[PDB]
């Protein structure tokens, strides 16, 4: 297996390098290739053999090799470069890929999360179900903590919150769900979704009795 650093960091416009170390049998003898995968899409080839790039990949990407360690260097970072990067080479009749490197771009403008708390629809209540959806978007850095409440009392059970994910504007988004029965839905006065981010909390509240 080819050894890559698990993650590297860099700011906008700065140069970052990702190493890929192998042995004299694979990297030392044969060409090296690099691949990019943004979390939303699949794999994309960015350079091949050594420093050649396919059609449509920017001039900022370039590759080099010194002995058994190949390097992918990104000259001036941009927001779209935040992705996973994998190297690959051949031993002989065998292909071997790297462990992967997560590239994180820092220095991007901070943003508080927009929070929308949806109530359960009337069509789901007819099936004696009730799921509350708390949608979170437009926040950077991509890390939030969600805590649900009902009549000012914290709830820990039947709560499922997705990790932060990169959306279209290059900030982050997340979502949290509160699955409960339709009788549990009307049993309380108000439910709320508290979203804390960078030491600041945004809270949205919903009320069954009023609505």
């Amino acid at each position: 297996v080819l050894t890559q650093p698990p993650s590297v960091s860099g700011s906008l416009g700065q140069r970052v390098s990702i190493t890929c170390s192998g042995s004299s049998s694979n990297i030392g003898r044969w060409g090296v290739n690099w691949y990019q995968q943004v979390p939303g899409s699949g794999l994309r080839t960015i350079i091949y053999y050594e420093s050649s790039r396919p059609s449509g990949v920017p001039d900022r990407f370039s590759g080099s090799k010194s002995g058994n360690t190949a390097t992918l260097t990104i000259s001036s970072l941009q927001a779209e470069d935040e992705a996973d990067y994998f190297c690959a080479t051949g031993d002989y009749n065998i292909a071997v890929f790297g462990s992967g490197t997560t590239l994180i771009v820092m220095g991007q403008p901070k943003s508080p999360p927009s929070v929308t708390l949806f109530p359960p629809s009337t069509e789901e209540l007819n099936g004696n179900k009730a799921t509350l959806v708390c949608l979170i978007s437009d926040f950077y850095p991509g890390s939030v903590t969600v805590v649900w409440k009902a009549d000012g009392s914290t709830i820990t059970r039947n709560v499922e919150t997705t990790r932060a994910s990169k959306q279209s504007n290059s900030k982050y988004a997340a979502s949290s769900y509160l699955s409960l029965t339709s009788s549990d839905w009307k049993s309380k006065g108000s439910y709320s979704c508290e979203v804390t981010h960078e030491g600041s909390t945004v809270t949205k509240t919903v009320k069954p009795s009023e609505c």
Binding site: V1, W30, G31, N33, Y35, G42, L43, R44, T45, Y48, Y49, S52, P54, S55, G56, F86, A88, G90, N93, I94, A95, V96, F97, G98, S99, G100, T116, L117, F118, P119, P120, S121, E123, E124, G127, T131, V133, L135, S137, N158, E160, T161, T162, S165, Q167, S168, A173, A174, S175, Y177, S179, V206, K207, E210, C211
Partner: protein, 232 residues
Amino acid sequence: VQLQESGPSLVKPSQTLSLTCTVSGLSLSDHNVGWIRQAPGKALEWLGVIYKEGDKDYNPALKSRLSITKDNSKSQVSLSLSSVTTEDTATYYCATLGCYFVEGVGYDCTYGLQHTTFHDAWGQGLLVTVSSASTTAPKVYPLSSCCSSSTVTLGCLVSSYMPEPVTVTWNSGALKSGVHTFPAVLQSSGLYSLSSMVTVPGTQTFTCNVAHPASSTKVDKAVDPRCGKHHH
């Protein structure tokens, strides 16, 4: 030129995973096609490759369970992986093995590259999950944040389905500005649920188009944007 994977996205453990890579705008006669997979949050794993003339190479660790064939006339490459376990749950990719002559050294090859045009040549990737759970179609519900703002926010809840993935569009793909489809969460019930949201600054109708190929279901769901008229 396109490479498209297809096949069941849900297979039972100990059974055989079979996928098909259909190659458009290209001739399998003079193109090497290989397979690579990516387990959830794992590095890429090479599976194997079938060369132009039908020759094959495999990953030694998986050789015993691996079979790759191809039909030039159908423009199809096949992948069989037998006795699958949960470890075999992954996103499977097919790609070309483009080879080129390096004037000074010799021949070398790159996965995901076309041999002469040097264009990108990756498949879209197909997530297949090794699980004993059965295929559950989603129940889709409208989301309304009414319970009078400047930017009304509505959406669709795609609830309690198995297996991943579902694909959500709005108004047959016409509405793309202001939309965001969130990744799915896995709940206590053992099923997946996700939501898609539309923020718009109305004068139009909003229907979301949910599709779940595993259950061959496709639901169009109209979402009522209006507030004080419906409730009163």
